[PDB]
Amino acid sequence: XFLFX
Amino acid sequence: TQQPIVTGTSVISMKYDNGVIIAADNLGSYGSLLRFNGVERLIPVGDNTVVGISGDISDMQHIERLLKDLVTENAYDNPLADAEEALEPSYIFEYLATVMYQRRSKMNPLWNAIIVAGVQSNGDQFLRYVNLLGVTYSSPTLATGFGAHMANPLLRKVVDRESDIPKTTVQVAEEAIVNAMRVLYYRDARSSRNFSLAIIDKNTGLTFKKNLQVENMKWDFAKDIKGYGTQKI
Amino acid sequence: GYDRALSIFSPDGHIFQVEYALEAVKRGTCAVGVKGKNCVVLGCERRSTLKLQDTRITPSKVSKIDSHVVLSFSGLNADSRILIEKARVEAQSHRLTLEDPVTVEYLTRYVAGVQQRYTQSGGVRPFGVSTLIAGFDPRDDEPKLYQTEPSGIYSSWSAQTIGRNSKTVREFLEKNYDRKEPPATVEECVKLTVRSLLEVVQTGAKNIEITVVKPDSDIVALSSEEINQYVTQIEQEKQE
Amino acid sequence: GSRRYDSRTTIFSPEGRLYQVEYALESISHAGTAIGIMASDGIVLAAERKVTSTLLEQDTSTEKLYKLNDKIAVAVAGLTADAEILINTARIHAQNYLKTYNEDIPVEILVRRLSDIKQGYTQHGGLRPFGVSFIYAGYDDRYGYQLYTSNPSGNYTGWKAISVGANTSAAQTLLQMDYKDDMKVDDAIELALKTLSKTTDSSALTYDRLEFATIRKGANDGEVYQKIFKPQEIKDILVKTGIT
Amino acid sequence: NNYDGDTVTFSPTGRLFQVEYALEAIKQGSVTVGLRSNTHAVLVALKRNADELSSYQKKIIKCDEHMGLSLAGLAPDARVLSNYLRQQCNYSSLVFNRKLAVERAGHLLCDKAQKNTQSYGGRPYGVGLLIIGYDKSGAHLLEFQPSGNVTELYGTAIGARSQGAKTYLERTLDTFIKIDGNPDELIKAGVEAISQSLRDESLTVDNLSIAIVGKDTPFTIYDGEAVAKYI
Amino acid sequence: QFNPYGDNGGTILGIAGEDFAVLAGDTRNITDYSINSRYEPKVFDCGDNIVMSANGFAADGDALVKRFKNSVKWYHFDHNDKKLSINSAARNIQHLLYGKRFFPYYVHTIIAGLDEDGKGAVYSFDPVGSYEREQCRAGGAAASLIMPFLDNQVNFKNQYEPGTNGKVKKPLKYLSVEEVIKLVRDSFTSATERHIQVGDGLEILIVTKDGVRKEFYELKRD
Amino acid sequence: MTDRYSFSLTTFSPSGKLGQIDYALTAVKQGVTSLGIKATNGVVIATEKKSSSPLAMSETLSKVSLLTPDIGAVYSGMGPDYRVLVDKSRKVAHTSYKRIYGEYPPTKLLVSEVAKIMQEATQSGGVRPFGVSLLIAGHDEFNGFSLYQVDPSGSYFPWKATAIGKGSVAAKTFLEKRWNDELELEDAIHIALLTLKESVEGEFNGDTIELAIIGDENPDLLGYTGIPTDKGPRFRKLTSQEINDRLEAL
Amino acid sequence: TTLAFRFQGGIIVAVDSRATAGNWVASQTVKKVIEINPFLLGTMAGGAADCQFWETWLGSQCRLHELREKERISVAAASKILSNLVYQYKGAGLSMGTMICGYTRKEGPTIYYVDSDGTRLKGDIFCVGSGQTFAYGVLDSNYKWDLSVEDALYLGKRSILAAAHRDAYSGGSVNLYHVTEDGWIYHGNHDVGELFWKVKEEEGSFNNVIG
Amino acid sequence: DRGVSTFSPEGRLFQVEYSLEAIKLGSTAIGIATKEGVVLGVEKRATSPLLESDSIEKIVEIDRHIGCAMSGLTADARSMIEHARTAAVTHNLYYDEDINVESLTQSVCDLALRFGELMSRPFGVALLIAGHDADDGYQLFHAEPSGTFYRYNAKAIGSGSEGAQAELLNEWHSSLTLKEAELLVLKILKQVMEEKLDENNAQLSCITKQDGFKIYDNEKTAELIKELKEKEAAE
Ligand SMILES: [Mg+2]
């Protein structure tokens, strides 16, 4: 896997 | 969450021009490769479907009861239960597929690999696989456990693609399945010599063969094998 | 649980349990609300058939919901306590989540919502209570006065009265209250409130309670002697 | 179904009264008279036992006067069984408050909560209200000596002197006549007994037909003592005031 | 009289009056017709308006690609029962990869309606439904009544003056049953049938509501200018 | 201890044109080093001119596509057969995915279709429902092989105008359906060579205003 | 389905009467006479064994019940209502006292718990009051011997001596004349048998009369030896023979 | 990398556009600012789904407040709705770094820092994300309260650029917002690729780089 | 007594029929739908002159594209409005779009019959739900406590409904402008109202695609009342 700045 | 105690080994199947073939040995093995044979792992549902189950025997017997239960239920208030509104392989598979996935999602899976082999009402061959994770896939040849590793390669020589199915006869398909069962006996420690084979043909119906044995095995060459390299005697 | 529908419709389209709740309000001691230019005053009747009362400890007719909002009522005293508690809890709940005290309109809308819910819930009877809710919104100098009733309808009033002989004191306010020019000062507003109660009460002794609410959480209750001075002034001016 | 047999205990009359509350008050008016009188230096609780029998064990009996904590007592008028349910609730509420704040419960807070339970039975649940009126006699460090009453409606009010149960009309007139604000406990004791003696439906008021209790500061230096009078102690106070 | 207070009370002659009163709601409802051949099944509905400024109450609800009904009586009850049918059609698809048989649809409505006639506190459904569908055994028409009685028919009608259309279909039975592979002609027979239940008012463009399902025809509803052909 | 997740391999690719959109996927389904099927489709027409693929754990992927198809069906029932716009579908799928935030679907989801202005649209989702509209997205096993190539050939990244000293970028422009299918076919043949889980067959679903068309192409079976 | 009766079946009438409690007391009045007498060194409780049929074995039906080793109960009114109250009374002596303090409850507190159960049947939804009055005789270290009456309302009163049921009015008058504060246990048993003979019409012997005492500790009835502090139950049910012995010198 | 700072001319909000799955650069075109309402902004840092879902949910809760109270929600109230929500989910594994930035007449320009730990902070300057340290260094060094709007916009842009360069998990493009009494105003998307060289040439910085 | 969900011998629900009687006692509310927008107007009907009329909220916003006028026991409408607003916002959260006026109405009507022995009685209030969506354009719906809703070109509910509806029958055509519709609502309100119509005892609103749902100021309504009188005196 999931996206994560 | 559980651990399987007594298990069944590979189930192998393939399509031919007029139907499908499925086979499974009659053995229940323990954890340390101990045996307990006298286990039928092919469940005929109606006269158009055979369900081949591998993995935990206790969970297999639970699924067996569900299928028996399903047939009873379908007959309830159904005048066409033996005709147009009879259970189809696609219906039986989808029920089982639904159960396997909602069990894995409750973290209490049925520790099995299932192949549903049958012929549909329009004569279409049906072959599809479901397992304890609820993963499903179809192919001209389907096999579980060791069968996937050893049987599939042999069966795929006969039917590599969909276009090969019309060219494949029941005599050829049965030979391929029976040969594949012998190879599994040679190389699988949890396999047995005794097995059951079922043919579902659109023209000739369902044929169920029990107490089959592996024959024409090659052992003669073993006498010439001495030591592990340098031993001459 | 006890599920019975007690508040139901009649053939003529009335809900008798809600209408019989209004009758309980009409039996209640008179309560009046008058809002001036920079204040609101809540006047309340206390029936004089009860002597040997301990006025120190006896529940006061006007209740603080927060430091800036007050609630008076006519009807069943026991029922009023349940609305006051729920309102006080909601006032602290609003401060906790919105980081701002309730507006008078919001607190009214909540209390009216509770009264409404008891008119179409199983196993409960409506509140035998009408409320006057008065105060000043945070950082605002515009006086607010709202009325609620058992049905759950609420609305804003320049001045309003509820309870026994409320129709008499409403008659008085309707001709004595000018919309274009409300009571400019605290004294003027308190006087008009006392005058309106003196049409109904009997004697201006320990029978009248007055509470004056002003902007920025400035609420004070008047004593006997303080109220008695207004009674003495009105009666001397009347004799003309 | 069951709708047919429902008395609807929590509805309004066309006049806007609560039937079951009004009928419960009618029940209480037939109960033995209970009087509370608040003085500057203590509170008196006096109660008349309901037509005593000669073979009733008087000394080890509790009908009218119950202890809630060390600083609060109640006089009961109505169904004794109903009162005991509410008394055990009040005793628990008091200990819950002490556990939470490490301070004895203020009298009004205990009264309000017990009154709020009664209210609940008149607005929801479809059960009969509690056929009980209480006189609460208590002391706290905020308001000092306090008298309250609660009734089945759940309404409560504060008093200098009050009666509940039978002949309250007559009792309240006699108390209103002889009571004054600078009264002592010993004077309040005499008033309570004289009042019961005139309002009683019995031929003559005797020790065996009475329950008596005082809340004084008679103990050494800024502490409150609850005295639930023994039969012999009632017999003595009845001779001393010259009623027997 | 004394035995019509609730649905849990039999009358001395063994009648359920609350069920009979629910049945009365259907008779007050606007007429709707159902008929079928071997290839197609048709629903025709006379929609009712409050006045000339109002819209015409929608009578026909789709349940799946192969099944739907027309209603007469309490519209909200039709919504509850049609929503239940949608879920049972949907359950059958998701779990069994199987289109729900029209006969099983009937059985499920019957059993849902029944429970509401044996329990205190609840009430019977106040709506009648005509279910049409095409499943593995061909075309089907069902009549639902909130007593729980479901009936499979070649044709029928429910609502005010329904007896007129029901008599016509009884006469025409031998003709319309053999309208195979011709949708328009089977609708025409349905429109001529509902016409026998009209008084003073006639079929207009925004008044008539038609639905059809069949062999190579998903359940589709025709309203407005789409039904102008059949006037 | 029972592990509820598995990896069925496969790789998917969505590309948005001017008046069209394509969603491609290989047809190979695998477990570990075994081939389950050489033809098991995982790119589906969901109705309302929306094509969908949930690549990763096939069981979770089948479950999600099944639930979304059902979501489209009930959107018709509840909103008078109204067409589900691609943006509305994308938001619905976020809620389906985030619904299982603490027992996630182990899939990478791509949907393709036309937006309400008739222009090609592609949306991509993470396992727990974070989504974004994109011109170009590869998902699954060979995403890392395909994605940089698409950056270069679709979005013309790192390409400058010859002679301009690398000051003027190569201008962006819409590709024809013919030119896009070339890049898809070359993307998958490339991925087949260098990724063991990619091969057997390539199925492309093309979405125009005229509807949903299919194209199939063989890939190497080793 | 389900218990839809969540509302009171006992309500106040306009006169302030609780009908169902009044009617319960009427049922008690129709009931067979039972009485209790408190002596200085014990308590006696007694009742007639009104036998439904002579084929019936009156031994099997026990109108006088042990609640704890030191507490016994007798009733007038509806036998079945009494039987379930004895079961509930024995259990509450354990659950709400013995399992907390490791000792049996004192008479007044067990009476208080029985009273509470009977008050609940007066106010709870979908139930009628219990149609019985109980006489509970008991001993405890700090209160000594005590006798309590419990009514359908849930009200209880302590008695020196009393009677309930059919001939209670006459029985109470008889006890008033005979009772003094110097009575020994044997004297109270003698008076109990005299009092009960008035209200009994038919046969009067040890087979038609049921009588129990709260008196001295009975080591022989304990069932074990070795713990000096455990001296045995104060409750003893008199035998058919023991009653007949005291009817000769009557 | 996200920052928001208060100055004379209102609030400056600057964010990058990179999404990463481990060392894999998933996207360079992500919108890390939610527009909520015309006077309210939300910045997102941490789990993409967690931020995206719950800040979209926050916008719905803010709309309901305004329908039920006939008044736009306060920045304090809006921030506490989100902070009270994440506190309910505390320990469940939500990952969110957030800044609720808006103007209302009663509060003025307000910035609230809110994180998945349940921390709710009011402040003039915040930097949230993996690259927050890089942004802070540039911002703190050149921050003045009496910065011009044009200079404040550049400083926010410049501070994100600084972070995008040094931080592996920040980059792609810079998105700029300005919040005043009349509401929030978009100041465009600046690709770091083109921006970096322009800034280096014009400012004469980035002397560590070759070129 | 008798059950709450009981059928009459005629086949109607007693409690629903009795609630319709409560709605007839309610103050008048009129809606008119046009191709230029939908107008909603109400009779405020203050019980006393001391009551501040601006605090009478009988026209209510559900979303930017959906308005609501009520008639009957108006306290009952609060939870219906709360549900409608939640449905409208919730749908926008799930589908990133405006919710259809019909779908919003259907959602409100699903509460109506959720009563029995759920809530204790039906709602004692009728709603005129006016809105715009891209599919079916400008729409006016009448939501009853029966759970039934009809779409209307124009509709009156409350005390003066049967008179007002007969007047709307003659006056309404398909080519009505928004300005014409505003005057028509004011004209028919003045006819059926007890007290004389002004900007304090009557309230106008409209919903347009461009500007969404707007409740008209007393100043704006006052000008339209003045414009209405002049035009009626002109012929
Ligand atoms: Mg490969």
From Swiss-Prot, chain B:
Subcellular location: Cytoplasm; Nucleus
Any one of the GO BP annotations: proteasome assembly
Major localisation: cytoplasm
Keywords: Cytoplasm, Nucleus, Proteasome
GO cellular component, one term: nucleus
Pfam family, one: Proteasome
More details: Present with 16900 molecules/cell in log phase SD medium.
Family, per entry: Belongs to the peptidase T1B family.
Subunit structure as annotated in this protein's UniProt entry: The 26S proteasome consists of a 20S proteasome core and two 19S regulatory subunits. The 20S proteasome core is composed of 28 subunits that are arranged in four stacked rings, resulting in a barrel-shaped structure. The two end rings are each formed by seven alpha subunits, and the two central rings are each formed by seven beta subunits. The catalytic chamber with the active sites is on the inside of the barrel. Interacts with CIC1.
PANTHER family recorded: METALLOPROTEASE TLDD, PROTEASOME SUBUNIT BETA
Function noted in UniProt: Non-catalytic component of the proteasome which degrades poly-ubiquitinated proteins in the cytoplasm and in the nucleus. It is essential for the regulated turnover of proteins and for the removal of misfolded proteins. The proteasome is a multicatalytic proteinase complex that is characterized by its ability to cleave peptides with Arg, Phe, Tyr, Leu, and Glu adjacent to the leaving group at neutral or slightly basic pH. It has an ATP-dependent proteolytic activity. PRE3 and PRE4 are necessary for the peptidyl-glutamyl-peptide-hydrolyzing activity.
Curated annotation (Swiss-Prot), chain F:
GO CC terms of this entry: cytosol; nucleus; proteasome complex; proteasome core complex, beta-subunit complex
Matching Pfam families: Proteasome
Annotated compartments: Cytoplasm; Nucleus
Biological process terms in GO annotation: proteasomal ubiquitin-independent protein catabolic process; proteasome-mediated ubiquitin-dependent protein catabolic process
Organism taxonomic ancestry: Eukaryota, Fungi, Dikarya, Ascomycota, Saccharomycotina
Protein name in the entry: Proteasome subunit beta type-6
SUPFAM superfamilies found in the cross-reference section: N-terminal nucleophile aminohydrolases (Ntn hydrolases)
Cleaved signal peptide residues: none
Primary role: Non-catalytic component of the proteasome which degrades poly-ubiquitinated proteins in the cytoplasm and in the nucleus. It is essential for the regulated turnover of proteins and for the removal of misfolded proteins. The proteasome is a multicatalytic proteinase complex that is characterized by its ability to cleave peptides with Arg, Phe, Tyr, Leu, and Glu adjacent to the leaving group at neutral or slightly basic pH. It has an ATP-dependent proteolytic activity.
InterPro entries: Ntn_hydrolases_N, Proteasome_bsu_CS, Proteasome_sua/b, Proteasome_suB-type
Keyword vocabulary terms for this entry: Cytoplasm, Nucleus, Proteasome
Homology family: Belongs to the peptidase T1B family.
Primary localisation category: cytoplasm
Lineage top rank: taxon: Eukaryota
Organism: Saccharomyces cerevisiae (strain ATCC 204508 / S288c)
Curated annotation (Swiss-Prot), chain G:
Keywords carried by this UniProt record: Cytoplasm, Isopeptide bond, Nucleus, Proteasome, Ubl conjugation
GO biological process: proteasomal ubiquitin-independent protein catabolic process; proteasome-mediated ubiquitin-dependent protein catabolic process
Main location: cytoplasm
InterPro entries reported in the protein's UniProt record: Ntn_hydrolases_N, Proteasome_alpha, Proteasome_alpha-type, Proteasome_asu_N, Proteasome_sua/b
Protein location: Cytoplasm; Nucleus
Entry GO terms, CC: nucleus; proteasome complex; proteasome core complex, alpha-subunit complex; proteasome storage granule
Pfam family, one: Proteasome_A_N
Recorded superkingdom: Eukaryota
Annotated crosslink Glycyl lysine isopeptide (Lys-Gly) (interchain with G-Cter in ubiquitin) location: K108
Function as written in the Swiss-Prot or TrEMBL entry: The proteasome degrades poly-ubiquitinated proteins in the cytoplasm and in the nucleus. It is essential for the regulated turnover of proteins and for the removal of misfolded proteins. The proteasome is a multicatalytic proteinase complex that is characterized by its ability to cleave peptides with Arg, Phe, Tyr, Leu, and Glu adjacent to the leaving group at neutral or slightly basic pH. It has an ATP-dependent proteolytic activity.
PANTHER family noted in UniProt: PROTEASOME SUBUNIT ALPHA/BETA (PTHR11599)
Additional observations: Present with 7060 molecules/cell in log phase SD medium.
Family: Belongs to the peptidase T1A family.
Name of protein: Proteasome subunit alpha type-2
Organism: Saccharomyces cerevisiae (strain ATCC 204508 / S288c) (Baker's yeast)
UniProtKB/Swiss-Prot annotation, chain I:
Entry's Gene Ontology cellular component terms: nucleus; proteasome complex; proteasome core complex, alpha-subunit complex; proteasome storage granule
Phosphoserine found at: S48
Main location: cytoplasm
Locations listed in the record: Cytoplasm; Nucleus
Residue numbers bearing the Phosphothreonine modification: T47
Annotated source species: Saccharomyces cerevisiae (strain ATCC 204508 / S288c) (Baker's yeast)
A GO BP entry: proteasomal ubiquitin-independent protein catabolic process
Keywords noted in UniProt: Cytoplasm, Nucleus, Phosphoprotein, Proteasome
UniProt gene name: PUP2
SUBUNIT field: The 26S proteasome consists of a 20S proteasome core and two 19S regulatory subunits. The 20S proteasome core is composed of 28 subunits that are arranged in four stacked rings, resulting in a barrel-shaped structure. The two end rings are each formed by seven alpha subunits, and the two central rings are each formed by seven beta subunits. The catalytic chamber with the active sites is on the inside of the barrel.
Protein name (database record): Proteasome subunit alpha type-5
Record family assignment: Belongs to the peptidase T1A family.
